[model samples]
Target: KVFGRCELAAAMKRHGLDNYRGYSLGNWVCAAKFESNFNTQATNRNTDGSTDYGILQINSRWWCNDGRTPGSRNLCNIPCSALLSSDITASVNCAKKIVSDGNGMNAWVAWRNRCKGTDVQAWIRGCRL
Candidate 1:
């Protein structure tokens, strides 16, 4: 499923992502924009042969099972497909787990490369939430 930026922001806020693990909502919004453009079904294949799944682009190598990939730690113990759903419940839960596990938003290269050290207010510019 695809979402407008405002919709994504509202959803994130509803999920209690506005202030999660010390990261601001803008940071999360910016990361999602760069990582998946608010598409729930987004997936990307990395050079290392692992695939990134969903809006936050959780990696298959360590976080979720894509089935095709072997030796996945599946730390979140969720199917990669689950992350692709529009509901975002599983994705949010897993993301919280990722952050608590010490990766923080650094788990996503997009956040480090794009959202980090940048003024992220634009990511939530028109969102009332």
Candidate 2:
């Protein structure tokens, strides 16, 4: 995992992600929590036969290639394995691209189901940043 909740907020702020692409830092943090618990190596296979990668749980169907997958759109043009790193730079950049495509945080199911309209302030409650 790259950071605790507070540390994540600070790191994202440093990366200019506090209000990136019209989504708040809290939204990203909350989505990350529900998606991967901030574990960069986290991966989940979906019922649709696609896999989600990294903290944001980006899907293999449309975002990144999982190598063994046959028909990936791969708009990110990146290997899903690249997102499974503690650095998170690649994952964050790819996520930004997703948001830029007009989907916003809706690209992540965790953001839609768990974070939307939720009390997200608690996510960064202890962080000084």
Candidate 3:
């Protein structure tokens, strides 16, 4: 499912992404935008053979199990397919697991390259939290 900017932001907030792990809502929003444009079914196969999945493009090598990744860790213990759901529940849960694993929001290069040191207020403006 595709989400509008506000819809994604609202859903994320409802799922407890507001300032989650010391990263502001805006930072999360920016990652979602550059990662998958609020898409639930987004997928990208990395050059290393792992896949990026869901709105945040989480990887299969370490985060989710795709059954196709070499050296798959499946630390989140979730099916990569589960991340494609529009519900965003599994996505949020696994994402939290990622940062909580000491990876920080920088786990996604989209955040590292696009959001860090950037003013992210533009991502949340007019959204009313």
RMSD of each: 1.1, 1.3, 1.0
Better of 1 and 2 by TM-score: 1
TM-score for candidate 1, residues paired by index: 0.94
Pitting candidate 2 against candidate 3, the one with the higher lDDT is 3
Q: What TM-score would each prediction reach against the true structure?
A: 0.94, 0.92, 0.95
lDDT of 2 by residue, 13-68 (tens): 77777889777789889999999998888999988888999888998989899876
What residue runs in model 1 are displaced by over 4 Å at the alpha carbon? none
Write down the lDDT of every candidate, Cα atoms only: 0.90, 0.85, 0.90
Deviation of model 2 at 125, angstroms = 1.9
List model 1 lDDT by residue over 30-88, tens digit each: 99999999999998998888999899999999989888777778999999999999899
- As for candidate 3, its clashing pairs are none
TM-score-best of 2 and 3: 3
Model 3 ranges with Cα > 4 A deviation:
none
User: Least lDDT summed over 10 consecutive residues: which range in candidate 3?
Assistant: 120-129
Clashing pairs in 2: none
